[PDB]
């Protein structure tokens, strides 16, 4: 059965999913990013810092992540100096945006599908409806309402959220005061207590982070009533009851560009020194092996994308040349999403799933430095039960407690008497690579500055990695493969497709920019 789902909403933009269903299971899937704005085209010839304004407008939910990497692209391009405080503020605000995204997406974009009638027979369905029903869910309302708190911290340092450009080459525009930091801590603590611990976990962030294995997570759910009936515990039990752990596995190969630089190790941002300075480690997990991320291995294919091109392009020389969808579809093109691929040795240019799960696998890589995230939890989950909608979601929600602690510590680390900005030299020439881990995964900017102008500006967003269409080798993108194998109980309401696409927290505005 050929099924075309249009629109598949709650993916931050326009998504149309075409699947071939055989015996109730998706055998093939096509992800169609249907909206294009061409910010990369617009950025050409613009001020070198125009990305700080434009790139956040790629996306409302993850625009601060765009700002973070857009600034670091300039920091590397202009060989700037990053005062430790500025790095902390960037880290805090990047994490805070993600901390806002995690509940906002989970309740508003993802969890409401748990009330789908396909689960009506579940003993937990009524509770899921009470909790996650749109706009009235007892967990929906506070989770969504409180999701604004972390970005209040962002606004404290950035002036506002969304739509700040306060991360500039050389640091940040802002000069946080004592009340800014204390208020930010108070907001973060209140949000962590009120939502993350009381609602999501039913326990302390520390208790959740003691989970180093899948069995620990299962035991954590059954340890006591609070964790059992927490949104996390209920979600895990609901997933295991309704089968969200059975599909959405996807490629099983992951890309994490990492973010959250250790301030002392990225005072002079460079492309080469990026990986070592990361706290949230970069890492490519493919074929069961850990690889060090190298932006040089990133290529974007547009064979099935509505762009001109015949071979994969590294984003430094990347092009965004639209083709009319009418003509593109005659050539087999079906998405405005490029097809980012990573050159993994022995595997060639392969799709890599980006997102929290990718980060969690990267954090499980060996040889972690002291400042680096070293978490074996999702290596064990990956080996124990493998990827799925549930595991992918749990990776996302696992970062809440993890990032909260990082932000809480970074706020303490701020030395308010010290510099937040080093006046950079606005070099007329420079190639910059800024990358971060937006809430949805690896977000990367490749910028080429020439004649004090943006010569080239290529943005590869995490959902482009995940939702990008088939490459020249017809290899499905991570979401497309994750969709493959997804059961379809009701073709009229193919919620399982939404689960898989939303389990990636897919952002279509990011996908295409």
């Amino acid at each position: 059965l050929d099924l075309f789902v249009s629109p598949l909403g709650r993916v931050e933009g326009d998504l149309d999913v075409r699947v071939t269903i055989n015996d109730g299971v998706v055998t093939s899937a096509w992800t169609e990013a249907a909206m294009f704005r061409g910010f990369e085209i617009i950025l050409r010839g613009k001020d070198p810092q125009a990305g700080l304004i434009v790139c956040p407008r790629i996306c409302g939910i993850c625009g601060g992540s765009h700002l973070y990497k857009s600034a670091y692209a300039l920091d590397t391009a202009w060989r700037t100096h990053m005062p430790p405080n500025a790095t902390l503020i960037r880290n805090i605000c990047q994490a805070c945006e993600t901390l806002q995204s995690i509940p906002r997406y989970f309740y508003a974009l993802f969890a409401i599908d748990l009330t789908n009638k396909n689960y009506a027979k579940s003993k937990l369905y009524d509770e899921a409806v009470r909790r996650f029903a749109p706009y009235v869910g007892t967990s929906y309302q506070p989770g969504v309402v409180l999701s604004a708190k972390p970005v209040e911290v962002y606004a404290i340092f950035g002036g506002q959220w969304p739509x700040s450009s306060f991360m500039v080459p050389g640091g940040v525009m802002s000069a946080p005061t004592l009340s800014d930091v204390t208020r930010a801590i108070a907001i973060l603590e209140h949000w962590n207590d009120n939502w993350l611990e009381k609602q999501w976990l039913g326990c302390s962030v520390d208790r959740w982070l003691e989970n180093k294995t899948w069995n620990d997570v299962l035991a954590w759910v059954d340890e006591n009533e609070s964790q059992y009936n927490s949104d996390c515990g209920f979600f895990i039990r609901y997933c295991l009851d309704v089968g969200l752990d059975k599909y959405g596995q996807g490629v099983g190969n992951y890309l994490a560009t990492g973010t959250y630089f250790e301030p002392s190790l990225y005072e002079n941002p460079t492309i080469e020194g990026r990986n070592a300075a990361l706290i949230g480690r970069s890492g490519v997990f493919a074929d069961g092996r850990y690889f060090e991320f190298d932006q040089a291995n990133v290529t974007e294919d547009v064979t099935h994308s509505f762009y001109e091109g015949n071979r994969p392009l590294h984003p430094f020389e990347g092009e965004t040349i639209p083709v009319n969808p009418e003509d593109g579809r005659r050539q087999g093109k079906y998405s405005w999403a490029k097809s980012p691929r990573y050159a993994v040795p022995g595997l060639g240019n392969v799709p890599l799933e980006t997102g929290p799960l990718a980060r969690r696998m990267a954090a499980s890589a060996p040889d972690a430095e002291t400042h680096q995230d070293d978490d074996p939890l999702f290596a064990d989950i990956y080996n124990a039960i493998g990827p799925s909608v549930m595991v992918r979601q749990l990776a996302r929600m696992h970062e809440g407690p993890k990032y909260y602690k990082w932000v809480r510590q970074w706020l303490d680390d701020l030395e308010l008497k010290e510099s937040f900005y080093t006046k950079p030299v606005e070099y007329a020439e420079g190639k910059g690579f800024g990358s971060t881990e937006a809430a949805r995964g690896a977000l990367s900017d490749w910028i080429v500055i020439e004649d004090s102008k943006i010569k080239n500006y290529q943005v590869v967003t995490p959902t482009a990695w995940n939702i990008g269409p088939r490459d020249a080798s017809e290899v499905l993108g991570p979401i497309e493969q994750a969709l493959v194998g997804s059961p379809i109980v009701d073709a009229e309401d193919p919620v399982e497709l939404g689960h898989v696409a939303r389990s990636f927290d897919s952002c279509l505005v990011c996908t295409v920019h």
């Binding site: 933009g13 294009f36 409302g60 939910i61 306060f166 004592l178 505005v509």
Partner: protein
């Protein structure tokens, strides 16, 4: 009142900003203020044909559509077909045509919907335009004479993104019987928010008054006004951003970021041409090319000169201290 929220050439920033709403929060606004949010791309439960059924009913008049909120640009490319923005089986512009004409009120939220915004910057690959404006030029996609069924033009809630209050308070006013209290300026913006300037309530106006310039970012923003060296457009930008603080915390200018004039139709001003980002365009290095709204260069510079001489000592020192 039924609300249908569509995203065209959008980044969803206005939705996310909208979701940050407080007093009322989005959930209370959707549920507790009689505002039936029929669908929203970022929040709507329906997908596929189920979502299309809602859209068509509003488009064809099967069910009432009281408020049509459009976020993002009306994408007309390629060649006016709008296929660079395909939504629910149609070009988004086609949905806009039907839903805007079927809606009692049409609200353009964000510069993209109001005026074209960032996607409308040259070369405008998506053929982006606002609902009723293309930058400052009235007419946009729907035409200058478009009026909703209640006789109102597109209510432009500008911003990149719009502050949640700029839309929610309007929605509350509509829901609480205060639609008549809503007055719109020449850009169809609610005057209750856009008669003030971004500078209105800015923490640096005293520095602006005494022409004390922020010289550098970071700790340099502990003093001074961003007008002179960072191209702050606050004095030329209509907004409550420093009256109604962003995220209930701050604003760009308070935090040390120049106002980009994102409530004004020309945003991004100068299309972010080289030298215009976080810089004040000046003539001879001393006279800003753009002076505050309602001022002329001669009197502004003369007053500025007098202000510097009269500038008190505190205006030259850090004030936003740790």
């Amino acid at each position: 009142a039924s609300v249908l929220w569509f995203q065209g050439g959008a980044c969803s920033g206005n939705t996310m900003s909208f979701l940050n709403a407080d007093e009322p929060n989005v959930v209370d606004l959707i549920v507790d203020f009689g505002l039936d949010l029929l669908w929203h791309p970022s929040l709507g439960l329906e997908l596929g044909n189920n979502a299309q059924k809602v859209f068509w009913d509003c488009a064809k008049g099967e069910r009432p559509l009281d408020i049509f909120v459009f976020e993002g640009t009306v994408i007309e490319a390629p060649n006016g077909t709008g296929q660079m923005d395909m939504f629910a089986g149609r070009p988004m512009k086609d949905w806009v045509t039907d839903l805007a004409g079927a809606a009692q009120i049409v609200v353009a939220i964000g510069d993209c919907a109001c005026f074209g915004g960032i996607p409308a910057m040259e070369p405008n690959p998506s053929g982006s335009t606002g609902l009723q404006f293309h930058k400052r030029e009235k007419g946009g996609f729907l035409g200058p004479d478009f009026r909703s069924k209640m006789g109102l033009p597109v209510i432009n809630v500008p911003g990149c993104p719009a502050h949640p209050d700029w839309i929610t308070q309007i929605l509350v006013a509509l829901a609480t019987g205060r639609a008549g209290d809503i007055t719109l300026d020449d850009l169809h913006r609610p005057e209750t928010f856009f008669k003030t300037f971004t500078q209105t309530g800015c923490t640096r106006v005293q520095f602006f008054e005494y022409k004390q310039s922020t010289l550098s970012f970071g700790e340099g923003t502990r003093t001074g006004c961003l007008f002179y060296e960072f191209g702050c457009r606050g004095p030329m930008t209509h907004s409550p951003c420093n009256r109604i603080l962003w995220n209930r915390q701050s604003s760009k200018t308070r935090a040390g970021m120049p106002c980009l004039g994102c409530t004004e139709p020309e945003f991004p001003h100068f299309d972010l041409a080289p030298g215009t980002v976080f810089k004040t365009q000046k003539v001879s290095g001393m006279i800003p090319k753009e002076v505050p709204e309602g001022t002329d260069h001669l009197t502004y510079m003369g007053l500025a000169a007098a202000a510097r001489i009269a500038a008190p000592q505190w205006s030259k020192e850090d004030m936003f201290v740790v």
